[PDB]
Amino acid sequence: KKNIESGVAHIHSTFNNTIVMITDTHGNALAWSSAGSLGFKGSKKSTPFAAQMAAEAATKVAMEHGLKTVDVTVKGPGSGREAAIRSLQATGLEVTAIRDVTPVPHNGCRPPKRRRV
Amino acid sequence: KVDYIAANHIEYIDYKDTELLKRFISERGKILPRRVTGTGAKNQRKLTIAIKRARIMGLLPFVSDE
Amino acid sequence: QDTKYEIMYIIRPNIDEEAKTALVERFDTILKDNGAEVIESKDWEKRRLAYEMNGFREGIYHIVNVTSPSTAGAINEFDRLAKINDDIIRHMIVKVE
């Protein structure tokens, strides 16, 4: 509703999950989806297929309210970073600009221990 | 073989000549290593000190990605 | 001998015409009265900034060169009022060689 037709889409995908949320430029939340909701489970939610379906189940709803172009936010070193954008461009949207924002510190944090397996 | 930046007999960096200073930052806003831009040995240091002074008084950005 | 100094600082755009002058001369004074040799004052450039500081995006860039002995308190007294003032954003004292 209210046909904003101008917003931004965020992407955030770990080694074990993926999410995509689409809001306006500010942006108050509009529509989002994730492989967690789509019925997939655990050992599979990090696959370049879950990205496709999450992207679709989000865009097919978001564009209802009125939306043609969008901006793209890519966090999350993972494996759906590629499928997600193309899959947005597949179901008829206007991915125009692509900026990669990954939080990198200036060395002021202590990461956890290394894992021994 | 890479020509030195200071063929022009420059002496003082002055940390304000931003035109003079843009030769060495990354197109993103980082710093470029000597072996990449082929600079001097004592020139590599004062360059960095200059631009670090500049990055406080706003005459240059910390991050230019947006 | 005596060292050298370049004291550049920022002033907001929302200044008046008189406040600027009174401030500049006031700092000239508190420079002198502690044994400084104020050489000159200038206004570098009406510049914006590559990133905001508090609520601003531009600022006037004034600058003064001064010489004095090392034990001359003409620097501590400066920074003791610059960083507690209001119309001044930042500043940077630097030895000049």
Added chain:
Amino acid sequence: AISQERKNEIIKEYARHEGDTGSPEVQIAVLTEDINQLNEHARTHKKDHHSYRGLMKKIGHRRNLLAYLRKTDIQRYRELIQRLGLRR
């Protein structure tokens, strides 16, 4: 510590003759001045371990020059220590 002003000024009040920058009297006078100033600095910042070491070295060197001055003449040695006022 000191700067060329007093560094050059004193080396003429203990100069044996003109240009006595050797002259184991002058060297120990200068070292006395400098170790006094360094004592002041240490009383100010008493955790600057990396300069108290240099203080020690200077003290030792002055001790050595004094020892040498004594074993070639005595009247010079006594008259100087009465001139500089040291040697508990």
Added chain:
RNA sequence: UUGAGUGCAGAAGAGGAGAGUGGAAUUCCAUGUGUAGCGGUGAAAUGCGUAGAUAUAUGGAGGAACACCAGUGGCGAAGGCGGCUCUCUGGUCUGUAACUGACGCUGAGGCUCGAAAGCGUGGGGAGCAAACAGGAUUAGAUACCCUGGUAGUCCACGCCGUAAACGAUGAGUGCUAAGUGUUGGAGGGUUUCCGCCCUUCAGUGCUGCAGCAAACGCAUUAAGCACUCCGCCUGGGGAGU
């Protein structure tokens, strides 16, 4: 006057102490949007969530470490030192050859410094994490894996005095083929040389000849040739008891 030292002329540096200051990031807090999950694993579970979570946007708070430059680079006697600016302050190197005239070297007892962990007194506390709790795997698992978490990690002044504190290579000084890079210099030709070429001082790496080595290898930064001063050793356990 050659060793040592001082004068005069220059050069580099994450050498040290004190005083302020900057941005990025993680986290807690305030508010707008927003709907059912988030997070975790080899697989799962514990856990937080419909008292509205994750996400997302704006601002605030607080402590800590300093992205890129970063380099077999630099400095320090060793432990070690990397955001920026200021006040105090040590040491090293090249040139000149004013000046004193062997003032040197090493150095039992003594004194000083001395990573991390640890103790005391008073602060501070964001992340991380011994102990501890819960969840898992296992015949058993008071362990490895996961979710939490206390001292500690930081600051001031005291204390202790130990590491594979390592190049497992004490210190001073002189002599004995080469080649190759690199930090800081001083000279000479070409010269726009500030972009080449030649000579030399000081560190710093790799290859390699005599010689040495039980072999492995080392070789102007000797583990070669030699003098001076110090420390230490004499089968393995018992025991640094």
